[PDB]
Design a protein around this ligand. Structure first.
Ligand SMILES: C/C=C(\C)CC/C=C(\C)CCC=C(C)C
Ligand SMILES: [Mg+2]
Ligand SMILES: [Mg+2]
Ligand SMILES: [Mg+2]
Length: 305
């Protein structure tokens, strides 16, 4: 229990719609045939989304919850089945996803994950401009690239060094794609010059590292159980040749250090104008809601028990 070593100087919130949103995710999952088997009521994927996007209108929060569900269903295929150890099969599947992200219609014998991604594309297109769909699609593309990088590690029995793992981990988690949904949840449109400012990129990177490293500390047990080493704890242990307790200590020191980086750089956002800065503060608060949502959900979730 590492609760006491996962403290943030900011709190999160949860949408009042959390439980109805979760039930609507199980409907969507059944409807698209993503539920394998019998236990499904303990996935609670909607309760993650409810915390990550706590001021979203119910219809946007439902897209986010179905998107988070999609990522977990995809991720357990990558991390707990043979497709995550076969690059050729991953490439074949990612080519259908990327065709669907460009707006192509699923074919009759495209898999359930393909039909479901096309549903989420269609629904995001109803709520997002073309500029946003492009940014989101490109973040999702890099997630697929990170997933294929994991597959080659699995195929080779490789373990990357800390520097390589941390840099690839920023993409393997799809957190940048989940961050794009903050704009829709908060009904904001950041101008290109604010979106890409060095400090905003450093805050996004910081927040993504925190969410991934927090996840790594809480998920090393189940990842060890599937002989998987895409985890800061296991990668530190391999690099420093230290005890599991010492690797966990080092992982949590990196997590803590990253919280410090995020909190300090929050104070370094340039003043563009009242409007832009109000929209950026909503976005940066969004990153904080995600940081809290990841920890608060993961501590209570069957998935890490
Ligand atoms: C995936 C990024 C994390 C490791 C934890 C935060 C969870 C999500 C952003 C949605 C679920 C996505 C998975 C790839 C598990
Ligand atoms: Mg996983
Ligand atoms: Mg994974
Ligand atoms: Mg994990």
């Amino acid at each position: 229990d590492y609760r006491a070593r996962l403290v943030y100087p900011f709190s999160g919130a949860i949408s009042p719609h959390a439980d109805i949103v979760d039930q609507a995710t199980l409907a969507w999952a059944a409807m698209f045939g993503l539920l394998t088997d019998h236990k499904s009521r303990r996935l609670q994927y909607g309760l993650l989304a409810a915390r990550a996007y706590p001021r979203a209108d119910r219809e946007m929060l439902q897209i986010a919850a179905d998107w988070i569900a999609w990522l977990f269903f995809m991720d357990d295929q990558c991390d707990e089945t043979g497709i995550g150890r076969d690059l050729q099969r991953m490439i074949a599947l990612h080519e259908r996803f990327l065709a669907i992200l460009d707006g192509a219609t699923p074919e009759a014998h495209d898999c359930a994950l393909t039909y479901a991604l096309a549903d989420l594309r269609r629904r995001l297109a109803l709520r997002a401009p073309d500029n946003w769909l492009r940014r989101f699609s490109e973040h999702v593309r890099l997630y697929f690239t990170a997933n294929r990088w994991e597959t080659v590690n699995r195929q080779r029995g490789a373990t990357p060094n800390v520097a390589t793992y941390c840099a690839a981990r920023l993409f393997s988690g799809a957190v940048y794609a989940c961050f794009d949904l903050i704009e829709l949840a908060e009904q904001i449109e950041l101008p290109f010059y604010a979106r890409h400012h060095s400090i905003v990129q450093q805050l996004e990177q910081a927040a993504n590292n925190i969410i991934c490293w927090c996840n790594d500390v809480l998920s090393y047990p189940k990842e060890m159980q599937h002989g998987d080493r895409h985890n800061l704890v296991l990668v530190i242990q391999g690099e420093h040749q230290c005890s599991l307790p010492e690797a966990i200590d080092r992982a949590l020191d990196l997590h803590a250090r990253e919280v410090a980086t995020f909190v300090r750089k929050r104070t370094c956002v340039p003043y563009f104008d009242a409007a832009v800065n109000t929209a950026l503060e909503k976005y940066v608060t969004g990153l904080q809601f995600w940081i809290c949502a990841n920890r608060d959900w993961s501590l209570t979730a069957t998935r890490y028990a």
